[PDB]
Amino acid sequence: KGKLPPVYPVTVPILGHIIQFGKSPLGFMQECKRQLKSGIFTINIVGKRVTIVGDPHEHSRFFLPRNEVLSPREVYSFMVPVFGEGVAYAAPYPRMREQLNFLAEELTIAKFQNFVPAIQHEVRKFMAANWDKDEGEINLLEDCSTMIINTACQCLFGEDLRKRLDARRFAQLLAKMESSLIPAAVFLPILLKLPLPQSARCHEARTELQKILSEIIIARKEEEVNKDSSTSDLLSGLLSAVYRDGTPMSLHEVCGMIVAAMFAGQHTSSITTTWSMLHLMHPANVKHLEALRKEIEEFPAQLNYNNVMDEMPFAERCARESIRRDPPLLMLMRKVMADVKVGSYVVPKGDIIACSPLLSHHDEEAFPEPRRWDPERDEKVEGAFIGFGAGVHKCIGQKFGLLQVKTILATAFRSYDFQLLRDEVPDPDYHTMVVGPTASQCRVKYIRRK
Amino acid sequence: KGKLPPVYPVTVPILGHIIQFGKSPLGFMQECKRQLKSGIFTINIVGKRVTIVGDPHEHSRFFLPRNEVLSPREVYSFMVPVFGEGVAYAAPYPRMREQLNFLAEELTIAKFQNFVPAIQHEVRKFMAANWDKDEGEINLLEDCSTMIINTACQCLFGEDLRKRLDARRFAQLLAKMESSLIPAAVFLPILLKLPLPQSARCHEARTELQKILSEIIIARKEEEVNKDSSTSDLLSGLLSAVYRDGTPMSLHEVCGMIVAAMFAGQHTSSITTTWSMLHLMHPANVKHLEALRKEIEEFPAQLNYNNVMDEMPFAERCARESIRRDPPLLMLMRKVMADVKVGSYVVPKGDIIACSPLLSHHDEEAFPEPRRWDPERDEKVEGAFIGFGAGVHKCIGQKFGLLQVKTILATAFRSYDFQLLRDEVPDPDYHTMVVGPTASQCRVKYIRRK
Amino acid sequence: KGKLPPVYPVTVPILGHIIQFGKSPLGFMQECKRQLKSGIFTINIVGKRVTIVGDPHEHSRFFLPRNEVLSPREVYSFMVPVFGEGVAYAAPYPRMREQLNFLAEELTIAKFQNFVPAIQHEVRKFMAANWDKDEGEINLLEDCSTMIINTACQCLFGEDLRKRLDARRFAQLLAKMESSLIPAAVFLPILLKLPLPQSARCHEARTELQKILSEIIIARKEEEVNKDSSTSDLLSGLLSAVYRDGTPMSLHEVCGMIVAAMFAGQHTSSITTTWSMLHLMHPANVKHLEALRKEIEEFPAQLNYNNVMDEMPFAERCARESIRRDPPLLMLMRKVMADVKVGSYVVPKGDIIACSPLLSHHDEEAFPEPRRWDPERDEKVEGAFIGFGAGVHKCIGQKFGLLQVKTILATAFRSYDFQLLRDEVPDPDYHTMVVGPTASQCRVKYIRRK
Amino acid sequence: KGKLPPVYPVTVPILGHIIQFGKSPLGFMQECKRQLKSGIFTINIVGKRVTIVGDPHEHSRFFLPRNEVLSPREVYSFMVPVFGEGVAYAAPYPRMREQLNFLAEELTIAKFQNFVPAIQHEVRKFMAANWDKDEGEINLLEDCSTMIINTACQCLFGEDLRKRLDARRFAQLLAKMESSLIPAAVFLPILLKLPLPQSARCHEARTELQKILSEIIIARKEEEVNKDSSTSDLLSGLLSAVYRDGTPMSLHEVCGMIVAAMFAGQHTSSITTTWSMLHLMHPANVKHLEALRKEIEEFPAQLNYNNVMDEMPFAERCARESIRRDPPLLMLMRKVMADVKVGSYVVPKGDIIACSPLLSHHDEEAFPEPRRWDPERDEKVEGAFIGFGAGVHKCIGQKFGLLQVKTILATAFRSYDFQLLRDEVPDPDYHTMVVGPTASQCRVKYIRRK
């Protein structure tokens, strides 16, 4: 008609709903939905209006509008010290698009031919070193997370870079950058103006990463005209990029794109793999484990691009459904740059507008019995699954992430069985920025198959 | 006058002076002092009145009043997650005082007998493994920082504790805790109440540390009723503590005090040693270097208590003058709990009152040519030096800090000479919570001395 | 015409209209304005022609002409026993201007940097001492009037003066001066020549105040020589004034300007505050109370200059509308020293010309529904609001008075709610020299807000 | 001649003589007596003939004629706001007489049995609280005036009334009424018709007083119902008054008679006491001090009715001679309602006729050496003493006032000596409505006779 979305009653006058949300984001959001009789509704976070598009039939109103209407820039501004000035959403939108296209072109299926054996190579090296007995106890989340960083680095970076900057040194740098982030800055923008110790720690880590890239580039040139170097990887691909205006990507921007790529996939991919395995080993899912086993039954010892990309539709369903049930990114946000009509409401300029994969993936029309993990399900409302976003800002690394998840699944389950050390699959742990299964609950027995 | 101090005008709508303060802390405070023709004046940080006691003759008005009148509790609120609930300033003041007294008692000179060779052992091991060529290149700041944590842990903790938790693991846990902290929460206390990514990391680290300690204590208890040995350290010391009320220190508190001890001395002592060596190796100072060589000239290779405590008065002067010139802690603060007289003024209840070692150490009457490093100098206003604070909350760790600095200066300069890879002494880096010389400028070459 | 304004019929021959005016000043003036079908009309007070400029369109004809044309001296005659002979309107007009300029320099907004937290501190000290419970009953007029004198004195008098001449004592002296005045002397000029008992009491009080000022000055000069006697206040400021002819202000003149300043602000500023609180706490005005609450929502606990000066336009509207609806000064007067044009008419030399904030603030074109308190209204006739006068004799204390009102409003409604103990806002009491809400109708319940 | 009394020349026109009279009343009047060679003569007070009877032989011509012939109504008109409409001289004369009779009936010798102990109780309480050292300095006019209000209140009012309305609060209310009076209204009747700020303040004080009496009356009714008591005092006595026409006194009238009683005696009795003590303590009067001492040293510690009323002739002489020398009421007046013979002249209708205790008391035939204080003198012309008036309007409080004076004299000089802190007896201060010794000149040392 022309009215604002209904607003959930504020009881705590300075914090709003941040506390209820924090404690149980899904339960809280579902209560709002019920109490207000609407899938579109507004909550209050430290005094800021957050309008949630909690009706899957209306997702396109969030994902499809152009940047001049719904803008991610100010929402992702707390990440500027990580990406760098002029990198990603910080750059003007045409330029940001060019940068993200360059990244996407480093993740083409043509590059995937080499990725599959690089991934499988590192997975087997990990398994040989760590899962080496007849049977043993491990933390699956920790191990998947190691496999993901190692396989990613094996895929994206030449041996010279891995030497100087091994998955271990790389993780420490990225952890330093990450620990300095303050996502609360979205709702308290005053924080991006203050002096914080975080700024210096982040800039320290980013500068050191960029120095190591500089030294790698110089080392390659030393190899490079000798014909002794012709190392081709994500670093050299990005350095070869030329913007429409004729200019090359600066080292600064390359660094930023590499950091962005590593941040994007590190926890999400590793959480997707862990949940998938947790489900697949649970006795209730024995039928799904059999289907996976039949899917990979006749794969060669050394997997090829055809096996993983074209011949694992069921494992793909396992991964997507794990993200459907427990999406690692709970909430996507944009700044409303002009009034937008959404369902029967106007969401006013200056609002934050959000669409929550967590809430949408538990819409009971779209996903009946949403806590039941069922890889065979399909969304019952078109576009209801948004675990990788959609439209304007849809995930460009979706295929690369799934490639790693699927390769690990086929390699692990070909050689091992696993046994939960609990009756039920882990609870999600909502306390972190990227949400995965509770770490203390992820201990598992592996059993070598013979 | 008996009225409020002069207020420096705010031209930055909602930030106040916090920006100008960042660009140049000393320059800003001094301009204020000059433009207002007063050493006592009030600036504004994010809406908070901050009254600065910038007249060295008035130091006692900040450092001498009772807690009931000037309290640091609210100012150190942001550190509750590290120290823990009801530890140190969070506890009631008689109880606070009891806790700090127990810690100070673990740092008395009576403990120092064994400290000196325990510190030498660690220094020489580090130098052996890391400075083992005729000449090489190092980051002095990084290297002093390593020596300081290694020396501290060897002094403070028994072998068995050093087995489960070596210096590295310890430093890692301390860093995890530290990364979560925001000093600015002082001026935006709403931060203290928000569910943040940081709090989770912090709680986890303190909980892991506490868990490590609990298992050491159980191992000791059982290994004391079988009496193989007798571990005497910081830990056993705090454990043997009992309040006036009769009851012992809780494990929670013990762990809090250890953390406080570790954070307190980690950067400060390391920065003090580093500045000292940076000044001493400089050409402009070779005369001061000669006196040090002279002071330590007929000391034995196996240093003892008397050498360091009694026979290094000049080395001590070097360390103090390094702190004088570039104090690691720029600003000390209290909450004003009741109106207080300061100079001719009354600082009103509710103000934050501050006394700045940086501002005071550069008062030209008290320290002429403030920027010149001169270990033979003396303060020309009484109580002008406040590098370790004073009065009610004076540093309890200053003797132990100096013991570390002095032993290292003796031990390093005995075996080595050093050369600065810059014409000038490094600039101070004002971007960190504890201020030291700019780390990137601290590259130095070590020259063995045969 | 170029003839006289119309003349309201005189029935009571010798008193004229003074009885009718006294009973109901607004009613009576409005009835005149309706009946004669003219905003410019002449009434008769004790035999004297008084021409009222009651058409707001014609306000400039009263406020702009020079002193030599429209002269306030004769109308403010009755105030000479308080100001002193040769002070303010009693001095030649150029010297008068100099005196008022000196007083104005003592009230510049530059001084507001410190005035704001000085005022708020006095205000919190009163509320905490007198509104200390969770609810309770008070006469809001008496309380606002107490806060105003307390805050003025904090701002304007050095602490040596405040000790000798505290708020209670100062109010007693001013009351003894006030209670001796007879505005009617303007129309019965013989009264100024009789030795009435009012005359002696006025002289005693003014003398005792000058005696106190003199002792304070002498003590400052005794103790003076350093920059120690930097006591800097309204008194020392006026004492350093030097006229254009090179002579300094006498203590007689300084005393006069001080009395003038206190008289000017005392009742007016407290009435203005009292009304505002009365209108704001009225259930009818919740949309206004709400708007004040939003305007001040994000202020610090310690109001600062910027908060009050730059960030309270709405609160300022509330004060000005309260003065619009019930102006504390009902009637402004000049002696016509030469014939003057006003609208279609000539006001002859020798008349008293008047302009009435009461009447003009109720002109139904300029202020429709003028009995409705509407802080969001804007005047609809240019220059219609004359609560602080205008033109040659505009109020010089306006910003200072409003500064006090605004600081009390932000401080009051921040920590308290209020309930008015009657259905309607109090009636104005027209029987006093400065008009405020009827005191016995100003009983009110405060309620602490957690 | 012998038609009109001789008229003293007016040289200052619109004022006449009021200024000369004001400066030096006794001087100016005697000069008129001499200059015109007549004790009967007419001066001019702001255009108004005032015929003074300065010949004591002619006194009865002023004091005896009926109210209808010589009226005090218009002369005491200015006190209507204090007495109340329709009270005292404002009532019809027959009714005025009834009201005054009722007041007199409360001040008769039957009441005095209670009064003497009540007065002595208050005097002793005051001295024990204030004159409690071996010696000390006091202002005797202040202290006497304090004792007079405390003693009068203890005589005339039950303890219940004094609790709700104590001496201090009663004085403040009276003082508020007093300072609103303008005796000049006698000559400018216009003044009593105008709405003056003074008239408003007086109404406010009177109303608050009447309100307090109504509260006490109610509490008393409630006591009678308990029948714990029937509290008897001046209030209760006035309340049971019933006029000839059968109607009771209204609260309005009771309040008026009370206010009249307090005004009547407050300054007059307090001044009479103060003069008396001043004379008696002065070195020239030691014989009188000794005679006083001889008279009172024969009394018991608790004075009674007979002691003070029948056994203190010399003390009564001191008081009366103090009033003789310096009458507190300078000038008594009547409106002349019909021509009247005086001596050998006629005073025409419309004149104010006057008889001056100051002038008559200084007639050298009646009182040789009039500035000489001699309690042993008697008037040498019959009826020449008019300190308490005479005839139809003779003072009805005369006995009560002197009872107070004498009780104070006896109690003071019984236990104390005094020293004037001055060479001479203080000058009278003619500038107040009721005339006493100059207050600043009334500092005295008490010396305890231990």
Ligand code: HEM
């Ligand atoms: C399972 C693993 C992953 C998940 C669950 C995931 C999820 C998402 C989601 C939900 C969005 C939408 C964000 C929004 O709408 O604000 C997104 C966007 C994006 N993703 Fe991922 N992602 C994954 C892996 C990756 C990887 C491995 C990369 C890069 C190598 C990547 C690169 C990006 C980029 C650059 C965007 C922003 C696209 C744009 O703004 O145009 N993602 N991702």
Ligand code: HEM
């Ligand atoms: C060069 C090394 C050090 C420097 C420059 C330093 C500096 C300071 C300063 C300036 C203060 C006063 C804080 C205030 O007024 O708010 C302080 C207090 C304190 N210091 Fe240190 N410190 C050093 C080493 C240490 C060490 C090694 C420890 C313990 C292991 C320690 C423990 C403490 C404690 C517990 C307080 C608070 C005492 C109280 O509140 O009563 N310090 N230090």
Ligand code: HEM
């Ligand atoms: C709500 C507070 C106040 C109100 C409503 C008010 C009102 C007025 C008005 C109506 C006039 C014009 C008088 C006329 O034209 O005859 C005036 C003039 C004046 N006011 Fe105020 N006033 C306030 C506060 C103050 C204060 C605090 C001061 C000084 C401390 C002050 C000082 C003066 C002076 C000196 C004039 C005469 C200006 C001249 O003749 O040039 N006023 N004020």
Ligand code: HEM
């Ligand atoms: C030393 C103390 C007093 C002195 C010197 C004094 C003096 C006088 C004088 C001179 C008159 C005549 C007024 C005239 O003729 O116009 C008078 C009348 C009067 N006095 Fe007093 N008075 C004193 C105390 C009192 C007291 C204590 C009361 C009662 C409390 C009182 C009640 C009255 C009344 C009611 C009248 C008017 C009588 C009438 O009009 O019939 N007086 N007094």
Ligand SMILES: CO[C@](c1ccc(Cl)cc1)(c1ccc2c(c1)c(-c1c(F)cccc1F)cc(=O)n2C)c1cncn1C
């Ligand atoms: C940086 O990773 C992003 C990304 C965003 C934009 C661009 Cl150009 C590139 C990458 C991304 C996206 C949404 C995010 C976050 C991060 C984070 C987040 C954080 F803030 C810090 C650390 C880790 C985090 F996942 C919290 C969050 O709430 N949302 C919605 C990404 C993309 N694909 C998967 N990821 C994870």
Ligand SMILES: CO[C@](c1ccc(Cl)cc1)(c1ccc2c(c1)c(-c1c(F)cccc1F)cc(=O)n2C)c1cncn1C
């Ligand atoms: C003295 O206060 C004045 C003022 C006037 C001139 C100068 Cl040089 C300085 C001050 C002022 C002005 C007009 C006044 C009055 C007083 C008074 C008045 C009084 F007569 C006694 C007590 C209180 C009174 F307000 C009755 C009156 O009718 N008018 C029009 C002032 C200025 N701003 C606010 N005020 C109040």
